[PDB]
Structure formats: C-alpha cells, structure tokens
Amino acid sequence: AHLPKVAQSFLNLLCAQTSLTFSIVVLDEHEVVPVARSYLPQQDNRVSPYGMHLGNRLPAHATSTGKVLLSVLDREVQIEWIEKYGLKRLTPYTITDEHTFLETLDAVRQSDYCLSTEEHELGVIAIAVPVLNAQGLTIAALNCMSQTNRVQPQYLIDQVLPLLRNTANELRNLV
Ligand SMILES: O=C(O)c1cccc(O)c1
C-alpha cells in the first residue's frame, strides 16, 4: 500500500483536538513502521521519543500497534512468528512469556483495541486500533502515543478511543 497522503488530514484533526500524537503504522516482518504522523508546528516540538518520529522501526511485541497487527493472524501463524523472532525484554513490563502473549493477542482480537503502557520505553504510553480497508482486511493500525506523566490511562480509554474508532471508521471507506 502507498496512501499516507489522505490520512495526514485526519491525524492533524485528532491532534488539534487532544494535543497528543497520532500515527499510521505498518507491519514489516517483525518490526512496525510509522508511515504518517500528526504534525502542527504552532504547538508541537520536533524532539520526540523513539518511534514517535516518522521513520523509526520498533519491535511488534512491545507496541500497542504491533500487538494489534499480530492479533489478526491465525494462532498457529502467531506461534510460528513467536518461534522465529522471539520476545526480547526491553522494559520491566515487556511481555516475554509465550502463553501470556497469545492470551493478549486473543484479547486484542476480541476487543479491537490495545493499550500498551511503558512496554517498549520508560515513560511512554499508547493506544492503538486496527485500520481496515473496504474488503475488511486489516491493513494498518492507528495509534496515539504520549508520555505517562502527561496523560492518564482512562483518558485514553474514555476519550481518545472513541475518536480513534470514528477516524478508523471513516478511513475504511477511503482506503
Ligand atoms: O505503543 C506504541 O505504539 C509505541 C509508540 C511509540 C513508542 C513506544 O515506546 C511505543
């Protein structure tokens, strides 16, 4: 896929609303790649953690995005994926057990969102949702990253998640 241009407007929309950082993320093998991000120069600075700036590749098993994108696959394909690349711990909170990681991916499947709190880098939080195409294929993930000292976990649940779901929903018809 190569359609990050029409999405740039929705992301700035979500940021001007909430002062946070939104992105579209693509799964490549075992790392996930940001392909668009919300940028408003009048209020956002250009210094950002690992992966909040566009370009950087992060491991799938520690990001809210990456866990969302693995939940779609079948269980045996997930298993064959955890076998290949493994789960290297990065913070005191990374999911490194296998039975635990499968039961998360099944819960992110059923529930359609993933909140990951400090599971890749200390002081960073994110909520992600799947972004589908017309055919219903999961094609990317849309996520909201911030620092745990500025945003509380239920604001992400109570407020961001509704907006996230509306925005994913209106992309579906355009991609
Ligand atoms: O959970 C994420 O998608 C995420 C995004 C950026 C940095 C990070 O540590 C995690």
Side-chain angles (χ1 to χ4, degrees), residues 128-171:
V129 295
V131 180
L132 276 35
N133 82 337
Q135 305 163 304
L137 278 174
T138 301
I139 74 167
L142 167 81
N143 100 304
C144 167
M145 321 149 287
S146 178
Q147 319 240 59
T148 29
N149 69 323
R150 282 194 308 269
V151 64
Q152 287 220 0
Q154 193 59 188
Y155 186 102
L156 299 200
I157 299 299
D158 260 30
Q159 303 224 224
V160 189
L161 185 56
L163 289 184
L164 274 193
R165 287 202 232 278
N166 307 346
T167 293
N169 221 318
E170 292 298 311
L171 283 151

mmCIF file of all heavy atoms in Angstrom, residues 128-171:
data_model
loop_
_atom_site.group_PDB
_atom_site.id
_atom_site.type_symbol
_atom_site.label_atom_id
_atom_site.label_comp_id
_atom_site.label_asym_id
_atom_site.label_seq_id
_atom_site.Cartn_x
_atom_site.Cartn_y
_atom_site.Cartn_z
ATOM 1 N N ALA A 128 -3.826 1.756 20.463
ATOM 2 C CA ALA A 128 -3.892 1.515 19.024
ATOM 3 C C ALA A 128 -5.207 0.841 18.661
ATOM 4 O O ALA A 128 -5.790 0.120 19.479
ATOM 5 C CB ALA A 128 -2.730 0.642 18.548
ATOM 6 N N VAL A 129 -5.672 1.086 17.431
ATOM 7 C CA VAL A 129 -6.831 0.377 16.859
ATOM 8 C C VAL A 129 -6.536 -0.083 15.431
ATOM 9 O O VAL A 129 -5.834 0.612 14.676
ATOM 10 C CB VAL A 129 -8.131 1.222 16.890
ATOM 11 C CG1 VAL A 129 -8.556 1.484 18.316
ATOM 12 C CG2 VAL A 129 -8.007 2.532 16.096
ATOM 13 N N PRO A 130 -7.073 -1.228 15.016
ATOM 14 C CA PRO A 130 -6.905 -1.669 13.626
ATOM 15 C C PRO A 130 -7.583 -0.733 12.646
ATOM 16 O O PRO A 130 -8.653 -0.178 12.912
ATOM 17 C CB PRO A 130 -7.591 -3.035 13.610
ATOM 18 C CG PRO A 130 -8.682 -2.869 14.641
ATOM 19 C CD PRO A 130 -8.022 -2.078 15.749
ATOM 20 N N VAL A 131 -6.964 -0.591 11.483
ATOM 21 C CA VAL A 131 -7.482 0.245 10.408
ATOM 22 C C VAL A 131 -7.748 -0.659 9.211
ATOM 23 O O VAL A 131 -6.807 -1.189 8.607
ATOM 24 C CB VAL A 131 -6.504 1.366 10.052
ATOM 25 C CG1 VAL A 131 -7.066 2.217 8.944
ATOM 26 C CG2 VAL A 131 -6.225 2.189 11.275
ATOM 27 N N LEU A 132 -9.014 -0.832 8.851
ATOM 28 C CA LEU A 132 -9.359 -1.793 7.817
ATOM 29 C C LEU A 132 -9.540 -1.113 6.464
ATOM 30 O O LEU A 132 -9.694 0.108 6.362
ATOM 31 C CB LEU A 132 -10.631 -2.556 8.192
ATOM 32 C CG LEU A 132 -10.495 -3.781 9.099
ATOM 33 C CD1 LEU A 132 -9.391 -3.599 10.120
ATOM 34 C CD2 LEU A 132 -11.801 -4.043 9.790
ATOM 35 N N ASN A 133 -9.501 -1.930 5.414
ATOM 36 C CA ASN A 133 -9.867 -1.495 4.079
ATOM 37 C C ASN A 133 -11.285 -1.963 3.790
ATOM 38 O O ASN A 133 -11.888 -2.695 4.577
ATOM 39 C CB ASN A 133 -8.864 -2.004 3.031
ATOM 40 C CG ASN A 133 -9.122 -3.451 2.573
ATOM 41 O OD1 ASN A 133 -9.745 -4.257 3.266
ATOM 42 N ND2 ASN A 133 -8.615 -3.778 1.392
ATOM 43 N N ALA A 134 -11.803 -1.539 2.632
ATOM 44 C CA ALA A 134 -13.168 -1.865 2.222
ATOM 45 C C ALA A 134 -13.470 -3.352 2.384
ATOM 46 O O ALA A 134 -14.463 -3.735 3.018
ATOM 47 C CB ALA A 134 -13.381 -1.430 0.772
ATOM 48 N N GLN A 135 -12.597 -4.209 1.835
ATOM 49 C CA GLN A 135 -12.750 -5.659 1.880
ATOM 50 C C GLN A 135 -12.743 -6.221 3.287
ATOM 51 O O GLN A 135 -12.993 -7.421 3.451
ATOM 52 C CB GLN A 135 -11.641 -6.327 1.082
ATOM 53 C CG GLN A 135 -11.537 -5.861 -0.331
ATOM 54 C CD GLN A 135 -10.211 -6.237 -0.936
ATOM 55 O OE1 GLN A 135 -9.159 -5.880 -0.404
ATOM 56 N NE2 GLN A 135 -10.247 -6.981 -2.038
ATOM 57 N N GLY A 136 -12.463 -5.401 4.292
ATOM 58 C CA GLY A 136 -12.403 -5.873 5.651
ATOM 59 C C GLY A 136 -11.047 -6.373 6.080
ATOM 60 O O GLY A 136 -10.900 -6.785 7.237
ATOM 61 N N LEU A 137 -10.056 -6.362 5.185
ATOM 62 C CA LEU A 137 -8.687 -6.711 5.552
ATOM 63 C C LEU A 137 -8.134 -5.685 6.514
ATOM 64 O O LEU A 137 -8.304 -4.477 6.314
ATOM 65 C CB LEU A 137 -7.798 -6.759 4.317
ATOM 66 C CG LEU A 137 -7.815 -8.020 3.486
ATOM 67 C CD1 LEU A 137 -6.995 -7.751 2.268
ATOM 68 C CD2 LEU A 137 -7.210 -9.122 4.296
ATOM 69 N N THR A 138 -7.459 -6.163 7.554
ATOM 70 C CA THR A 138 -6.695 -5.252 8.404
ATOM 71 C C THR A 138 -5.428 -4.838 7.672
ATOM 72 O O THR A 138 -4.631 -5.690 7.273
ATOM 73 C CB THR A 138 -6.355 -5.903 9.734
ATOM 74 O OG1 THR A 138 -7.568 -6.283 10.400
ATOM 75 C CG2 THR A 138 -5.582 -4.924 10.594
ATOM 76 N N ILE A 139 -5.249 -3.538 7.466
ATOM 77 C CA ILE A 139 -4.186 -3.063 6.595
ATOM 78 C C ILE A 139 -3.178 -2.174 7.308
ATOM 79 O O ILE A 139 -2.043 -2.047 6.823
ATOM 80 C CB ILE A 139 -4.754 -2.333 5.361
ATOM 81 C CG1 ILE A 139 -5.286 -0.959 5.736
ATOM 82 C CG2 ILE A 139 -5.866 -3.136 4.737
ATOM 83 C CD1 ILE A 139 -5.566 -0.101 4.542
ATOM 84 N N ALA A 140 -3.530 -1.552 8.424
ATOM 85 C CA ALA A 140 -2.593 -0.760 9.200
ATOM 86 C C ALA A 140 -3.175 -0.638 10.592
ATOM 87 O O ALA A 140 -4.193 -1.256 10.911
ATOM 88 C CB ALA A 140 -2.338 0.610 8.574
ATOM 89 N N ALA A 141 -2.505 0.140 11.436
ATOM 90 C CA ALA A 141 -3.036 0.471 12.745
ATOM 91 C C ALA A 141 -2.828 1.951 12.975
ATOM 92 O O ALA A 141 -1.893 2.562 12.450
ATOM 93 C CB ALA A 141 -2.415 -0.330 13.890
ATOM 94 N N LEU A 142 -3.763 2.521 13.717
ATOM 95 C CA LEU A 142 -3.811 3.936 14.028
ATOM 96 C C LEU A 142 -3.666 4.033 15.527
ATOM 97 O O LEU A 142 -4.371 3.334 16.261
ATOM 98 C CB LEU A 142 -5.136 4.553 13.560
ATOM 99 C CG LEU A 142 -5.538 5.949 14.040
ATOM 100 C CD1 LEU A 142 -4.856 7.040 13.248
ATOM 101 C CD2 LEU A 142 -7.040 6.077 13.941
ATOM 102 N N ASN A 143 -2.733 4.849 15.989
ATOM 103 C CA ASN A 143 -2.410 4.782 17.401
ATOM 104 C C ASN A 143 -2.172 6.173 17.957
ATOM 105 O O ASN A 143 -1.975 7.144 17.221
ATOM 106 C CB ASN A 143 -1.201 3.865 17.634
ATOM 107 C CG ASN A 143 0.072 4.627 17.827
ATOM 108 O OD1 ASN A 143 0.474 5.437 16.986
ATOM 109 N ND2 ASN A 143 0.714 4.386 18.953
ATOM 110 N N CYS A 144 -2.173 6.248 19.280
ATOM 111 C CA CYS A 144 -1.997 7.507 19.992
ATOM 112 C C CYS A 144 -0.928 7.344 21.069
ATOM 113 O O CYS A 144 -1.162 6.670 22.075
ATOM 114 C CB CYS A 144 -3.317 7.948 20.603
ATOM 115 S SG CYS A 144 -3.101 9.248 21.769
ATOM 116 N N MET A 145 0.229 7.975 20.870
ATOM 117 C CA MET A 145 1.363 7.842 21.783
ATOM 118 C C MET A 145 1.555 9.082 22.640
ATOM 119 O O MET A 145 1.469 10.194 22.133
ATOM 120 C CB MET A 145 2.663 7.586 21.005
ATOM 121 C CG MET A 145 2.506 6.656 19.821
ATOM 122 S SD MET A 145 3.735 7.030 18.331
ATOM 123 C CE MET A 145 2.919 8.652 17.635
ATOM 124 N N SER A 146 1.871 8.904 23.921
ATOM 125 C CA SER A 146 2.196 10.045 24.767
ATOM 126 C C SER A 146 3.091 9.602 25.918
ATOM 127 O O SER A 146 3.532 8.453 25.993
ATOM 128 C CB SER A 146 0.926 10.729 25.280
ATOM 129 O OG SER A 146 1.266 11.804 26.141
ATOM 130 N N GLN A 147 3.361 10.537 26.814
ATOM 131 C CA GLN A 147 4.171 10.298 27.994
ATOM 132 C C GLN A 147 3.254 10.088 29.189
ATOM 133 O O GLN A 147 2.261 10.797 29.357
ATOM 134 C CB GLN A 147 5.135 11.465 28.248
ATOM 135 C CG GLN A 147 5.796 12.029 26.987
ATOM 136 C CD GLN A 147 7.324 11.941 27.001
ATOM 137 O OE1 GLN A 147 7.897 10.847 27.110
ATOM 138 N NE2 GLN A 147 7.990 13.096 26.873
ATOM 139 N N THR A 148 3.594 9.104 30.014
ATOM 140 C CA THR A 148 2.741 8.700 31.120
ATOM 141 C C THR A 148 2.592 9.785 32.183
ATOM 142 O O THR A 148 1.657 9.723 32.987
ATOM 143 C CB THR A 148 3.307 7.420 31.723
ATOM 144 O OG1 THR A 148 4.724 7.404 31.534
ATOM 145 C CG2 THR A 148 2.729 6.199 31.041
ATOM 146 N N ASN A 149 3.481 10.775 32.204
ATOM 147 C CA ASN A 149 3.389 11.873 33.152
ATOM 148 C C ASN A 149 2.508 13.018 32.665
ATOM 149 O O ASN A 149 2.291 13.973 33.415
ATOM 150 C CB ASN A 149 4.786 12.409 33.474
ATOM 151 C CG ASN A 149 5.434 13.114 32.293
ATOM 152 O OD1 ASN A 149 5.276 12.708 31.137
ATOM 153 N ND2 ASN A 149 6.175 14.182 32.583
ATOM 154 N N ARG A 150 1.996 12.962 31.439
ATOM 155 C CA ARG A 150 1.050 13.970 30.984
ATOM 156 C C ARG A 150 -0.360 13.436 30.738
ATOM 157 O O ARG A 150 -1.322 14.186 30.924
ATOM 158 C CB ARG A 150 1.561 14.656 29.705
ATOM 159 C CG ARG A 150 2.638 15.719 29.945
ATOM 160 C CD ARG A 150 2.866 16.601 28.703
ATOM 161 N NE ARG A 150 3.127 15.823 27.484
ATOM 162 C CZ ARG A 150 4.340 15.462 27.054
ATOM 163 N NH1 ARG A 150 5.442 15.799 27.736
ATOM 164 N NH2 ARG A 150 4.449 14.756 25.936
ATOM 165 N N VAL A 151 -0.523 12.167 30.352
ATOM 166 C CA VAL A 151 -1.842 11.603 30.074
ATOM 167 C C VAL A 151 -2.037 10.316 30.869
ATOM 168 O O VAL A 151 -1.145 9.463 30.914
ATOM 169 C CB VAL A 151 -2.050 11.344 28.574
ATOM 170 C CG1 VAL A 151 -1.087 10.298 28.080
ATOM 171 C CG2 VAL A 151 -3.490 10.929 28.318
ATOM 172 N N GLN A 152 -3.264 10.170 31.517
ATOM 173 C CA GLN A 152 -3.779 9.129 32.399
ATOM 174 C C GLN A 152 -4.438 8.015 31.595
ATOM 175 O O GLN A 152 -4.984 8.263 30.509
ATOM 176 C CB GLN A 152 -4.791 9.716 33.370
ATOM 177 C CG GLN A 152 -4.185 10.562 34.463
ATOM 178 C CD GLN A 152 -4.865 10.315 35.784
ATOM 179 O OE1 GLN A 152 -5.796 9.512 35.865
ATOM 180 N NE2 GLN A 152 -4.406 10.994 36.831
ATOM 181 N N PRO A 153 -4.433 6.772 32.098
ATOM 182 C CA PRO A 153 -4.806 5.657 31.210
ATOM 183 C C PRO A 153 -6.269 5.694 30.800
ATOM 184 O O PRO A 153 -6.597 5.239 29.703
ATOM 185 C CB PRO A 153 -4.462 4.404 32.035
ATOM 186 C CG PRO A 153 -4.085 4.904 33.417
ATOM 187 C CD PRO A 153 -4.438 6.355 33.510
ATOM 188 N N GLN A 154 -7.151 6.267 31.620
ATOM 189 C CA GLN A 154 -8.573 6.251 31.309
ATOM 190 C C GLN A 154 -8.972 7.364 30.355
ATOM 191 O O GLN A 154 -9.949 7.202 29.618
ATOM 192 C CB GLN A 154 -9.409 6.333 32.587
ATOM 193 C CG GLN A 154 -10.906 5.997 32.401
ATOM 194 C CD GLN A 154 -11.207 4.568 31.849
ATOM 195 O OE1 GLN A 154 -12.357 4.256 31.534
ATOM 196 N NE2 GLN A 154 -10.189 3.713 31.748
ATOM 197 N N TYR A 155 -8.255 8.492 30.343
ATOM 198 C CA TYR A 155 -8.440 9.437 29.243
ATOM 199 C C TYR A 155 -8.244 8.731 27.910
ATOM 200 O O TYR A 155 -9.007 8.938 26.964
ATOM 201 C CB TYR A 155 -7.477 10.615 29.377
ATOM 202 C CG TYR A 155 -7.650 11.755 28.378
ATOM 203 C CD1 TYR A 155 -8.294 12.930 28.742
ATOM 204 C CD2 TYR A 155 -7.128 11.674 27.090
ATOM 205 C CE1 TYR A 155 -8.435 13.986 27.841
ATOM 206 C CE2 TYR A 155 -7.264 12.714 26.177
ATOM 207 C CZ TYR A 155 -7.914 13.878 26.556
ATOM 208 O OH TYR A 155 -8.053 14.935 25.661
ATOM 209 N N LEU A 156 -7.245 7.867 27.819
ATOM 210 C CA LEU A 156 -7.091 7.108 26.588
ATOM 211 C C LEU A 156 -8.298 6.202 26.352
ATOM 212 O O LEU A 156 -8.764 6.049 25.216
ATOM 213 C CB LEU A 156 -5.782 6.303 26.624
ATOM 214 C CG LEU A 156 -4.449 7.059 26.752
ATOM 215 C CD1 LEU A 156 -3.284 6.175 26.280
ATOM 216 C CD2 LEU A 156 -4.486 8.381 25.988
ATOM 217 N N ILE A 157 -8.816 5.592 27.412
ATOM 218 C CA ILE A 157 -9.989 4.737 27.271
ATOM 219 C C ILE A 157 -11.224 5.585 26.972
ATOM 220 O O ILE A 157 -11.875 5.418 25.933
ATOM 221 C CB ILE A 157 -10.173 3.884 28.539
ATOM 222 C CG1 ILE A 157 -8.965 2.990 28.754
ATOM 223 C CG2 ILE A 157 -11.403 3.020 28.447
ATOM 224 C CD1 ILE A 157 -8.754 2.053 27.653
ATOM 225 N N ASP A 158 -11.519 6.552 27.851
ATOM 226 C CA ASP A 158 -12.796 7.259 27.831
ATOM 227 C C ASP A 158 -12.931 8.221 26.648
ATOM 228 O O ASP A 158 -14.029 8.381 26.100
ATOM 229 C CB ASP A 158 -12.987 8.010 29.149
ATOM 230 C CG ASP A 158 -13.907 7.271 30.117
ATOM 231 O OD1 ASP A 158 -13.930 6.017 30.045
ATOM 232 O OD2 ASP A 158 -14.611 7.940 30.941
ATOM 233 N N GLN A 159 -11.851 8.890 26.254
ATOM 234 C CA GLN A 159 -11.927 9.948 25.254
ATOM 235 C C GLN A 159 -11.232 9.603 23.946
ATOM 236 O O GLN A 159 -11.851 9.690 22.884
ATOM 237 C CB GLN A 159 -11.334 11.251 25.798
ATOM 238 C CG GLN A 159 -11.972 11.740 27.067
ATOM 239 C CD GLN A 159 -12.217 13.228 27.022
ATOM 240 O OE1 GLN A 159 -11.953 13.948 27.989
ATOM 241 N NE2 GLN A 159 -12.726 13.709 25.886
ATOM 242 N N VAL A 160 -9.954 9.223 23.986
ATOM 243 C CA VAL A 160 -9.218 9.002 22.742
ATOM 244 C C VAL A 160 -9.801 7.836 21.951
ATOM 245 O O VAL A 160 -9.978 7.930 20.732
ATOM 246 C CB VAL A 160 -7.729 8.781 23.031
ATOM 247 C CG1 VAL A 160 -6.976 8.783 21.725
ATOM 248 C CG2 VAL A 160 -7.224 9.859 23.948
ATOM 249 N N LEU A 161 -10.095 6.726 22.624
ATOM 250 C CA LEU A 161 -10.590 5.531 21.945
ATOM 251 C C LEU A 161 -11.853 5.799 21.131
ATOM 252 O O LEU A 161 -11.905 5.383 19.960
ATOM 253 C CB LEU A 161 -10.786 4.420 22.982
ATOM 254 C CG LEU A 161 -11.191 3.036 22.512
ATOM 255 C CD1 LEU A 161 -10.193 2.563 21.504
ATOM 256 C CD2 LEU A 161 -11.304 2.084 23.710
ATOM 257 N N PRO A 162 -12.884 6.471 21.647
ATOM 258 C CA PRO A 162 -13.981 6.862 20.754
ATOM 259 C C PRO A 162 -13.533 7.621 19.505
ATOM 260 O O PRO A 162 -13.887 7.201 18.397
ATOM 261 C CB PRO A 162 -14.874 7.685 21.687
ATOM 262 C CG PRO A 162 -14.773 6.968 22.963
ATOM 263 C CD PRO A 162 -13.292 6.611 23.062
ATOM 264 N N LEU A 163 -12.748 8.700 19.634
ATOM 265 C CA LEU A 163 -12.270 9.424 18.450
ATOM 266 C C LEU A 163 -11.491 8.512 17.512
ATOM 267 O O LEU A 163 -11.694 8.544 16.296
ATOM 268 C CB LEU A 163 -11.386 10.595 18.855
ATOM 269 C CG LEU A 163 -12.052 11.785 19.504
ATOM 270 C CD1 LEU A 163 -10.983 12.838 19.725
ATOM 271 C CD2 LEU A 163 -13.149 12.299 18.608
ATOM 272 N N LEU A 164 -10.567 7.717 18.065
ATOM 273 C CA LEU A 164 -9.826 6.743 17.267
ATOM 274 C C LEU A 164 -10.766 5.872 16.440
ATOM 275 O O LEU A 164 -10.589 5.738 15.223
ATOM 276 C CB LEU A 164 -8.937 5.873 18.165
ATOM 277 C CG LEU A 164 -7.514 6.348 18.545
ATOM 278 C CD1 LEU A 164 -6.667 5.221 19.163
ATOM 279 C CD2 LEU A 164 -6.777 6.953 17.350
ATOM 280 N N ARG A 165 -11.796 5.300 17.075
ATOM 281 C CA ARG A 165 -12.716 4.419 16.357
ATOM 282 C C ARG A 165 -13.492 5.151 15.247
ATOM 283 O O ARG A 165 -13.753 4.568 14.184
ATOM 284 C CB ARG A 165 -13.694 3.771 17.329
ATOM 285 C CG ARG A 165 -13.145 2.689 18.223
ATOM 286 C CD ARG A 165 -14.328 1.808 18.690
ATOM 287 N NE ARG A 165 -14.455 1.582 20.142
ATOM 288 C CZ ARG A 165 -13.759 0.666 20.817
ATOM 289 N NH1 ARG A 165 -12.859 -0.085 20.175
ATOM 290 N NH2 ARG A 165 -13.956 0.505 22.126
ATOM 291 N N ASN A 166 -13.902 6.410 15.475
ATOM 292 C CA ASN A 166 -14.587 7.156 14.412
ATOM 293 C C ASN A 166 -13.674 7.388 13.217
ATOM 294 O O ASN A 166 -14.126 7.372 12.071
ATOM 295 C CB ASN A 166 -15.089 8.521 14.908
ATOM 296 C CG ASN A 166 -15.927 8.433 16.155
ATOM 297 O OD1 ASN A 166 -16.367 7.350 16.539
ATOM 298 N ND2 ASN A 166 -16.155 9.583 16.802
ATOM 299 N N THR A 167 -12.393 7.651 13.476
ATOM 300 C CA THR A 167 -11.443 8.005 12.433
ATOM 301 C C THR A 167 -11.023 6.782 11.629
ATOM 302 O O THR A 167 -10.940 6.833 10.398
ATOM 303 C CB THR A 167 -10.234 8.688 13.071
ATOM 304 O OG1 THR A 167 -10.640 9.953 13.613
ATOM 305 C CG2 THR A 167 -9.142 8.911 12.036
ATOM 306 N N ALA A 168 -10.756 5.679 12.318
ATOM 307 C CA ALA A 168 -10.558 4.417 11.624
ATOM 308 C C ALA A 168 -11.756 4.098 10.738
ATOM 309 O O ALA A 168 -11.600 3.628 9.602
ATOM 310 C CB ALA A 168 -10.315 3.301 12.643
ATOM 311 N N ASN A 169 -12.960 4.379 11.236
ATOM 312 C CA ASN A 169 -14.172 4.007 10.520
ATOM 313 C C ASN A 169 -14.316 4.777 9.214
ATOM 314 O O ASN A 169 -14.740 4.210 8.200
ATOM 315 C CB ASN A 169 -15.374 4.240 11.416
ATOM 316 C CG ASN A 169 -16.384 3.141 11.310
ATOM 317 O OD1 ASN A 169 -16.680 2.647 10.210
ATOM 318 N ND2 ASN A 169 -16.929 2.735 12.456
ATOM 319 N N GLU A 170 -13.970 6.066 9.216
ATOM 320 C CA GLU A 170 -14.056 6.883 8.016
ATOM 321 C C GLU A 170 -12.857 6.729 7.092
ATOM 322 O O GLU A 170 -12.916 7.220 5.964
ATOM 323 C CB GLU A 170 -14.243 8.350 8.395
ATOM 324 C CG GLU A 170 -15.599 8.635 9.041
ATOM 325 C CD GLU A 170 -16.803 8.325 8.114
ATOM 326 O OE1 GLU A 170 -16.801 8.770 6.934
ATOM 327 O OE2 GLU A 170 -17.754 7.630 8.563
ATOM 328 N N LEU A 171 -11.780 6.067 7.519
ATOM 329 C CA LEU A 171 -10.730 5.716 6.565
ATOM 330 C C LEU A 171 -11.132 4.501 5.764
ATOM 331 O O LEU A 171 -10.879 4.435 4.556
ATOM 332 C CB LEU A 171 -9.402 5.424 7.265
ATOM 333 C CG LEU A 171 -8.590 6.613 7.757
ATOM 334 C CD1 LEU A 171 -7.773 6.186 8.954
ATOM 335 C CD2 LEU A 171 -7.723 7.143 6.643
#
